[PDB]
Amino acid sequence: LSASRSRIQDADYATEVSNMTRAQILQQAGTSVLAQANQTTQNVLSLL
Amino acid sequence: LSASRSRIQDADYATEVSNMTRAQILQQAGTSVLAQANQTTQNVLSLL
């Protein structure tokens, strides 16, 4: 019974580690591109 | 009558020594494998 409940309830680590790494990378890239996008409208001032 | 009762309830002292010597070895070999079994958890810790 212990083995069966373990198979139901417990958590792996290999998949969790992969998920964590993949999640962090997107966070970094998103923040960098967000800065790059907020900086965009500076161009308009050179018009006048 | 004494011989006939003797055949029923007395020990052997040739079988018992062998049984003891077998049980001791198997009892002793169990614990080393038990020690081996616990260590296999420590693999995951390296992933971090």
Give 3-state DSSP helix, strand, coil % of chain A, rounded to 5. Answer: 90, 0, 10
CB < 8 Å to A17, chain B: 47-48
Rounded-to-integer distance, Cα B19 and Cα B23, Å: 6
Rounded-to-integer distance, Cα B25 and Cα B40, Å: 25
The resolution in angstroms reads: 3.4
Rounded-to-integer distance, Cα B44 and Cα B13, Å: 51
Q: Does B47 touch chain A (CB under 8 A)?
A: yes
Structure tokens at A43: 């161009």
